[PDB]
Design a protein around this ligand. Structure first.
Ligand code: CLA
Ligand code: CLA
Ligand code: CLA
Ligand code: CLA
Ligand code: CLA
Ligand code: CLA
Ligand code: CLA
Ligand code: CLA
Ligand code: BCR
Ligand code: BCR
Ligand code: SF4
Ligand code: SF4
Lengths: 146, 81, 733, 156, 75, 30, 75
């Protein structure tokens, strides 16, 4: 590749290197539950506001049901990948060398046991994120544009 | 063996196929069956990409180097990624 | 092996996605499977066949189940001419409210689909009368499907699989198939016609409960034994007959009337019983020809040898063709398709002229949906026959065992065959198009008399030989003197001649100059379609551009740019270009049938007879005019029942237009496009964490052709099938 | 086949009536002596004498008032298809027979390639009339067996 | 290009061109249907291809015949 | 009643299990 | 050469507009007389192409819009 401002800069290389997918030195269960929190709380909007029931008074509870399923489907699409791309006793496929050249540990996420932990984090966070939107948006619901 | 490259006895030893292999498959070996006293040979068929230009430059009655496309490998498919 | 596909190791180690695509297309090609042997080759086919019968029986149990659970079958019987037959029910949770209303019809309670396959009439005729007959009809076929699945499994274990000599027994098979399969089944269907069907159409309800009490003929089973069979045709159904009751109901069971049933515009029941009885005998007697175990009957090997013409004009004649056929599966399949390809066209041609089911000549849409259906099936099957001809010349032909016989000679003057096919196609092409543009121009300038109207008189002479009196040529069966007329004046002519001159049926429609020009356009299709296929078959083994084509197989991409470029040289590609001309040809046939009938049904027969001589007439008065109701399936004002056909209509246009993308743009461009993409994905953060297991590559050269043709065909069928049904059903006339 | 003669078919004499009225409609808008009025009149006479010749030479008209051709060979109608047809076949050979003579004529040269992209006009002038008698000449070739070859096909 | 010259033809006939009443009310060529019917693909089939091809199709027998022939000839 | 259950099962579930079943079988390695 | 052909193309257009056109008539009522600058020989009935473009003339109605160009230059 090439070193352009976008691919390397202190602001960029600090933003990416400190979000769950890249914090290579913490337990993959939590790295799954953060990811599912941000994604789950994210997509409750468009389902609730643009779905086929937006006019009806069930727009709150029809979007949430929609987002809940989509998290479930991605949880399956997650598990299909983990079970078909790793073997139960094979080690990690992540790069173990940093840019400076320090040989660090291979990421536990790139591992059958790790990924199956990660999806457990994503699924539980995904549904937890998508209810937390529904509670806020239809209890503590004043300022928003909905 | 990925693809099968075969050179017959019609070949007149003109070294036009060897010079036209883009990945160094064919090569020239001595013979005694031509005026030129040399016939082509294909000892590295693995890297053979299948680009029939190797035998678009064999000037004989039908052909003297022939290429049969078999199964495809990661180098016989010319994948760079 | 080591992974999918289990039957091909060469594909298995292919790392790219090519393996997955090619692990599906080469599933059923049992010869090219690794480690195949001639015993396995047959035993898989035998098990596979039973798989195909399971589908056919399960498929037909679906129709009976829905028609009797969500259909109008008991009500439709009560008035066949005013109750739309119902196919099934609709439950689509995307439907809005005005669609739910619109698709509620046929006297149902929710949305339904109107059945255009014409099952409702067929089951009326053959005696079914309530829902309950249909349910047991469903269960039985479901059981038969279960039985077949057992057999496909059973004949794979040891001690139940046939050996080679069992399959290669070409004589003992032809006796059973001719005498048992074709023969007895036709005899037994006669039994059902005169024990259930005919009694149903006379008010008698006969079922498995009581079919032992009732007599098919009040003196039954006697008159046949004595020899005076002249009683079963005694007192037939009267002219004033109501199909479901006893008024005018005669008692004859076997007749020869030949006309139409006056009320229902169909063939008489008692004729169809006789005919299946007559050809129940021909096959039985034709079934004892060949020798099996009992020392009598011909040897098919001997018959082929004996027919060697003296003088040598046919070389060694048919010598050795026994083994070549009896050892080449691709040969046997080719013959089967050719024969099956013809009779399907025959079925299409006869059904619409001689309606064999009650109240099916006035359901106009059902006629069109059936005749068009069988021609397209016949178009596909006929292309396969030549396609497996080519595979024969490649894989299984042997140039030694067929020395100078009739088969090797067809490879010896292949130039003479190919060129003349080219001539006949060229002669038809220049003049059929030629006279057409001339007809077009002469009308553009406002002079319609200056057209070239050639009266199709030979076909009008033939119609006069069958009794049609419009043209007044006064020949056999149209002239009273003729002994041929006298030979039939008291058997079938009074009914047959009354049907042929009636102007309501489609029996021998009047033909004019328009019908002359179209027929050549049809004739042009068959030669040109044949030319591609026949050119493909005879040059499969080799030609001047590449005289060792046999060493590569039936289907290979090309042979490289040298020698001037060799794109589209495999005999596969000859089949490829062929399909385009099949769809065009069958296009010109079904077009012609629909428009001629759609003018007839309205009683506006002048419109076809004038507009059908210049092309703008076909484009204006058939395409543009008749699609007015279809395209309004949904507009910014509302929707209709026809909306679904309007949607499918465009859906047809969309797939068809996607077809071009794979035919025109060839592989090398897309492959360079993937490589950039497979670079971008490898450098994007958060997305370099997901890695393809199988590397991504563009489709292969042959795959694109196959894929490109799949879209073209699908879009071409759905488009026309939508216009055919919507336009006719829109007017129901 | 029921095709009444065009000189009798009232439908034929209807089409002749409309197309004349349609033209005379387009005429009562120009000056009675300008150039348009003459060209319109010219086409009007051309039309009437067109219809008359179609009702004179025995063309048979259907129920469309339009002529129909009987190509069955009924020699009451020979000038519709058979007579024009033979007229074509005479011409078509003339083109065919002449071209064959030229290719044979230039065949025995150093490179016949050059004498076909650059046609020899004089040689094609002493051959252009030999197509007047092609039926006679060819039929003798067929009998003498020089119209065809047997098994020497490519190269020579 | 083809969709551009389709876009121009329908937009101008439906929203701009057309006769004008002596009173002052304006009636465009296609009655101002572009704003509702051009959003559906079937709309571009009914009201543009099918409804504005009438003049070319039935152009036989008058001076616009040469367009009727070319229409076919270009197909 | 019965359609409202069988239509989703063959439209949503039975496809999903089918696609996920094949995907493992296609992508196996032994 | 390319420059020369254009001039020859221009020359015909000006010539044709002078010898075979209702231009001078068009200058009287440009609102409702079609511009015509091509007239066909009547051989095989093709004189039906000579349309009633009005202005006491006939011929193929042009659409390249030269007439507005020749009026804007005060011809
Ligand atoms: C069709 C697109 C769409 C729609 C209709 C919504 C709709 C909504 N979003 Mg959302 N969002 C979207 C896309 C969309 N989002 C995308 C693509 C992102 C990128 C991550 C976000 C990230 C986002 C955040 C972070 C938050 C919302 C929130 C909201 C809600 C308040 C909107 C507001 O105040 O402004 C509302 C239901 C707020 C909320 O609490 O939702 C209830 C909130 O905090 N959205
Ligand atoms: C394979 C076909 C088939 C089969 C299985 C049967 C079977 C039967 N028929 Mg039958 N039948 C058949 C064809 C067949 N028929 C045909 C084609 C005709 C037309 C001539 C008849 C005419 C016929 C009569 C007229 C009678 C039978 C009768 C019978 C029954 C007693 C036969 C002794 C038996 C159930 C007899 C009976 O008692 O059955 C009710 C009887 O009276 N059948
Ligand atoms: C009952 C009749 C019949 C039978 C038994 C067969 C059987 C066979 N045909 Mg065949 N064929 C038939 C009808 C039949 N076809 C018809 C009607 C046509 C004309 C359309 C063809 C056209 C045809 C071609 C062009 C080829 C075959 C090939 C084959 C063989 C391999 C099929 C395969 O693996 O692809 C199975 C394909 C798939 C599973 C995917 C196809 C996707 C389509 C679009 C589904 C829709 C197999 C022996 C092929 C062969 O032998 O290869 C060497 C071959 O090249 N046939
Ligand atoms: C508008 C569409 C169109 C037309 C007009 C043709 C016309 C023709 N195709 Mg064709 N083809 C088409 C689409 C078309 N095809 C498509 C879409 C495919 C699929 C790729 C094919 C595939 C195909 C194959 C594989 C073959 C043909 C053949 C032929 C020729 C048949 C003989 C004939 O009737 O000539 C009559 C002559 C004409 C129609 C030319 C009229 C034009 C004028 C008279 C020329 C001079 C004008 C000044 C003819 C030239 C076959 C052939 O070569 O026949 C011997 C042949 O082998 N074509
Ligand atoms: C002297 C000229 C000549 C002659 C005698 C023939 C003779 C023949 N051609 Mg033919 N052909 C020719 C030129 C000629 N060709 C040219 C120039 C072409 C290229 C377009 C073809 C393309 C062609 C095809 C595609 C086919 C034939 C076929 C045939 C055979 C059947 C006749 C037929 O179908 O006519 C075909 C007639 C045409 C295609 C019309 C074009 C011929 C032009 C108009 C004549 C040219 C004459 C020449 C320029 C005049 C020279 C004058 C000289 C003084 C300078 C027959 C052996 C067919 C065949 O194999 O049947 C057995 C066949 O399929 N030919
Ligand atoms: C073939 C079976 C099938 C079935 C049974 C359904 C069923 C459904 N689809 Mg659907 N769909 C299908 C195939 C199918 N689809 C396919 C193949 C496509 C691709 C073209 C789509 C694309 C599609 C879209 C784009 C949308 C639907 C929506 C819906 C819902 C209807 C709207 C509603 O009232 O939701 C009421 C119920 C809810 C809003 C909550 C969902 C309840 C979950 C499923 C439990 C319903 C769950 C709509 C929907 O609900 O999405 C939000 C919607 O927006 N579908
Ligand atoms: C673009 C070049 C062009 C083209 C296509 C035509 C085309 C035509 N000319 Mg024309 N013409 C041209 C340039 C051209 N002309 C020029 C430069 C002159 C001046 C010498 C003429 C003088 C001319 C005369 C005098 C006549 C034509 C005629 C015709 C006819 C046909 C439509 C004929 C028409 O008559 C109705 C005719 O008589 N042309
Ligand atoms: C086959 C008959 C035929 C013949 C012999 C001619 C011959 C001629 N046409 Mg013509 N033309 C024809 C058919 C024919 N055309 C057709 C079918 C059309 C409709 C597109 C036209 C449209 C047309 C326009 C013009 C001609 C013109 C001409 C003349 C000069 C070029 C020339 C005499 C030019 C003159 O007149 C001219 O402006 N033609
Ligand atoms: C390629 C090939 C192949 C195939 C082939 C085919 C596919 C063929 C087909 C063919 C066909 C598809 C044919 C058809 C035929 C037909 C016919 C042969 C017909 C006949 C008819 C008749 C005979 C009739 C008669 C009559 C009449 C006229 C009328 C009246 C009645 C009667 C009957 C008398 C194979 C495999 C072998 C192999 C080799 C190569
Ligand atoms: C009578 C008639 C008819 C019929 C016809 C027919 C049926 C025909 C056939 C025909 C045929 C069946 C033919 C065949 C042929 C063969 C051959 C074989 C030929 C050959 C030829 C040639 C060889 C020639 C050559 C040449 C010349 C001489 C000239 C030109 C040049 C050339 C060199 C080309 C119809 C009905 C239509 C109508 C009426 C009349
Ligand atoms: S195909 Fe290409 S790689 Fe193979 S031998 Fe020929 S030139 Fe070499
Ligand atoms: S090109 Fe052909 S002849 Fe020349 S060396 Fe190679 S094989 Fe031999």
């Amino acid at each position: 590749s090439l070193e352009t401002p976008v691919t390397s800069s202190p602001l960029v290389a600090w933003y990416l290197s400190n979000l769950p997918a890249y914090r290579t030195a913490v337990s993959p269960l939590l790295r799954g539950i953060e990811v599912g929190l941000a994604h789950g709380y994210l997509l409750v909007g468009p389902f609730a506001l643009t779905g086929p029931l937006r006019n009806t008074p069930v727009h709150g509870q029809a979007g949430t049901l929609g987002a809940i399923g989509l998290v479930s489907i991605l949880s399956v699409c997650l598990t299909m990948y983990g079970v078909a791309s790793f073997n139960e006793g094979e080690p990690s496929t992540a790069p173990v060398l940093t840019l400076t050249g320090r040989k660090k540990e291979a990421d536990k996420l790139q591992t059958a046991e790790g990924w199956s932990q990660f999806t457990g984090g994503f699924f539980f966070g995904g549904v937890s994120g998508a209810v937390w939107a529904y509670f806020l948006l239809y209890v503590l619901d004043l300022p928003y544009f909905f | 063996m990925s693809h099968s490259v075969k050179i017959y006895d019609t070949c007149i030893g003109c070294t036009q196929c060897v010079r036209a292999c883009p990945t160094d498959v064919l090569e020239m070996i001595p013979w005694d069956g031509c005026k030129a006293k040399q016939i082509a040979s294909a000892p590295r068929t693995e890297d053979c990409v299948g680009c029939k230009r190797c035998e678009s430059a064999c000037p004989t009655d039908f052909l003297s180097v022939r290429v049969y496309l078999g199964p495809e490998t990661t180098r016989s498919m010319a994948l760079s990624y | 092996e080591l992974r999918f596909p289990r039957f091909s190791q060469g594909l298995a180690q292919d790392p790219t996605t090519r393996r997955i695509w090619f692990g599906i297309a080469t599933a059923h090609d049992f010869e090219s499977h690794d480690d195949i042997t001639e015993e396995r080759l047959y035993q898989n086919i035998f098990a596979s066949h039973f798989g195909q019968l399971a589908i056919i029986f399960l498929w037909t149990s679906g129709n009976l189940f829905h028609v009797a659970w969500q259909g109008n079958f008991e009500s439709w019987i009560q008035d066949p001419l005013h109750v739309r037959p119902i196919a099934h029910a609709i439950w689509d949770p995307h439907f809005g409210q005005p669609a739910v209303e619109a698709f509620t019809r046929g006297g149902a309670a929710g949305p339904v689909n109107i059945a255009y396959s014409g099952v409702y009439q067929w089951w009326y005729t053959i005696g079914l009368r309530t829902n309950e007959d249909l349910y047991t009809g469903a269960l039985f076929l479901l059981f038969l499907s279960t039985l077949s699945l057992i057999a496909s499994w059973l004949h794979l274990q040891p001690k139940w699989k046939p050996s080679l000599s069992w399959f290669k027994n070409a004589e003992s098979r032809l006796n059973h198939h001719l005498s048992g399969l074709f023969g007895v089944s036709s005899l037994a269907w006669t039994g059902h016609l005169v024990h259930v069907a005919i009694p149903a159409s006379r008010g008698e309800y006969v079922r498995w409960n009581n079919f032992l009490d009732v007599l098919p003929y009040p003196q039954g089973l006697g008159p046949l034994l004595t020899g005076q069979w002249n009683l079963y045709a005694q007192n037939p159904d009267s002219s004033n007959h109501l199909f479901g009751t006893a008024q005018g109901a005669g008692t004859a069971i076997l007749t020869l009337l030949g006309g139409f049933h006056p009320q229902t515009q169909s063939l008489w029941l008692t004729d169809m019983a006789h005919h299946h009885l007559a050809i129940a005998f021909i096959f039985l007697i034709a079934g004892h020809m060949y020798r099996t175990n009992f020392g009598i009957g011909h040897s098919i090997k001997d018959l082929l040898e004996a027919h060697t013409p003296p003088g040598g004009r046919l070389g060694r004649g048919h010598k050795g063709l026994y083994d070549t056929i009896n050892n080449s599966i691709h040969f046997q399949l080719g013959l089967a398709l050719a024969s099956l390809g013809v009779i399907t066209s025959l079925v299409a041609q006869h059904m619409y002229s001689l309606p064999p089911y009650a109240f099916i000549a006035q359901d106009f849409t059902t006629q069109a949906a059936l005749y068009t259906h069988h021609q397209y099936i016949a178009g596909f099957i006929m292309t396969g026959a030549f396609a497996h001809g080519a595979i024969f010349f490649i894989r299984d032909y042997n140039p030694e065992q067929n020395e100078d016989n009739v088969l090797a000679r067809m490879l010896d003057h292949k130039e003479a065959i190919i060129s003349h096919l080219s001539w006949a196609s060229l002669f038809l092409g220049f003049h059929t198009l030629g006279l057409y543009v001339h007809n077009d121009v002469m009308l553009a300038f406002g002079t319609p008399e200056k057209q070239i109207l050639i009266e199709p008189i030979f076909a009008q002479w033939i119609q006069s030989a069958h009794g049609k009196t419009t043209y007044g040529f006064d020949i056999l069966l149209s002239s009273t003197n003729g002994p041929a007329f006298n030979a039939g004046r008291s058997l079938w002519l009074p009914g047959w001649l009354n049907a042929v001159n009636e102007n309501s049926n489609s029996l021998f429609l009047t033909i004019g100059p328009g019908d002359f020009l179209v027929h050549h356009a049809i004739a042009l299709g068959l030669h040109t379609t044949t030319l591609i296929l026949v050119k493909g078959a005879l040059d499969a083994r080799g030609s001047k551009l590449m005289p060792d084509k046999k060493d590569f197989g039936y289907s290979f991409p090309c042979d490289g740019p040298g020698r001037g470029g060799t794109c589209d040289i495999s005999a596969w590609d000859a089949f490829y270009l062929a399909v385009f001309w099949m769809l065009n040809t069958i296009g010109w046939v079904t077009f012609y049938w629909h428009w001629k009938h759609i003018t007839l049904w309205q009683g506006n027969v002048s419109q076809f007879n004038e507009s059908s001589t210049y092309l703008m007439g076909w484009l204006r008065d058939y395409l543009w005019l008749n699609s007015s109701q279809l395209i309004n399936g949904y507009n910014p004002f509302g929707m209709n029942s026809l909306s679904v056909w309007a949607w499918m209509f465009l859906f047809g246009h969309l797939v068809w237009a996607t077809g071009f993308m794979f035919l025109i743009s060839w592989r090398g461009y897309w492959q360079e496009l993937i490589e950039t993409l497979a670079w971008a994905h490898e450098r994007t953060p958060l997305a370099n964490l997901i890695r393809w297991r199988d590397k991504p590559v563009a489709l292969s050269i042959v795959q694109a052709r196959l894929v490109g043709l799949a879209h073209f065909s699908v879009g071409y069928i759905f488009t026309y099938a939508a216009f055919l049904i919507a336009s006719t059903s829109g007017k129901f006339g | 086949a029921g095709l009444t003669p065009c000189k009798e078919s009232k439908a034929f004499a209807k089409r002749e009536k409309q197309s004349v009225k349609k033209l005379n409609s387009s005429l009562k808008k120009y000056a009675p002596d300008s150039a348009p009025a003459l060209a319109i009149q010219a086409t009007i006479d051309k039309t009437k004498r067109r219809f008359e010749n179609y009702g004179k030479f025995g063309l048979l008209c259907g129920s469309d008032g339009l002529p129909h051709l009987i190509v069955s060979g009924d020699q009451r109608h020979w000038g519709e298809f058979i007579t024009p047809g033979v007229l074509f076949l005479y011409i078509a050979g003339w083109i065919g027979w002449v071209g064959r003579s030229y290719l044979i004529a230039v065949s025995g040269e150093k490179k016949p390639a050059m004498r076909e992209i650059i046609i020899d006009v004089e040689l094609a002038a002493r051959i252009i009339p030999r197509g007047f008698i092609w039926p006679v000449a060819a039929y003798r070739e067929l009998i003498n067996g020089d119209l065809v070859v047997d098994d020497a096909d490519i190269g020579y | 290009i083809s969709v551009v010259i389709f876009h121009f033809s329908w937009k101008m006939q439906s929203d701009v061109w057309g006769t004008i009443s002596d009173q002052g009310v304006v009636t465009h060529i296609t009655g101002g249907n572009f704003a509702q019917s051009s959003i559906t693909i079937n709309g571009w089939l009914r009201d543009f291809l099918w409804a504005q091809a009438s003049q070319v199709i039935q152009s036989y027998g008058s001076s616009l015949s040469a367009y009727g022939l070319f229409f076919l000839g270009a197909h | 009643n019965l359609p409202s259950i069988f239509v989703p099962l063959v439209g949503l579930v039975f496809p999903a299990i089918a696609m996920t079943s094949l995907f493992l079988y296609v992508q196996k390695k032994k | 050469g390319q420059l020369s052909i254009i001039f020859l193309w221009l020359s015909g257009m000006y010539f044709h507009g002078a010898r075979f056109s209702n231009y001078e008539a068009w200058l009287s009522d440009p609102t409702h007389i079609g511009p015509s600058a091509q007239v066909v020989w009547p051989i095989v009935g093709q004189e039906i192409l000579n349309g009633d473009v009005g202005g006491g003339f006939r011929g193929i109605q042009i659409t390249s819009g030269f007439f507005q160009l020749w009026r804007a230059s005060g011809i």
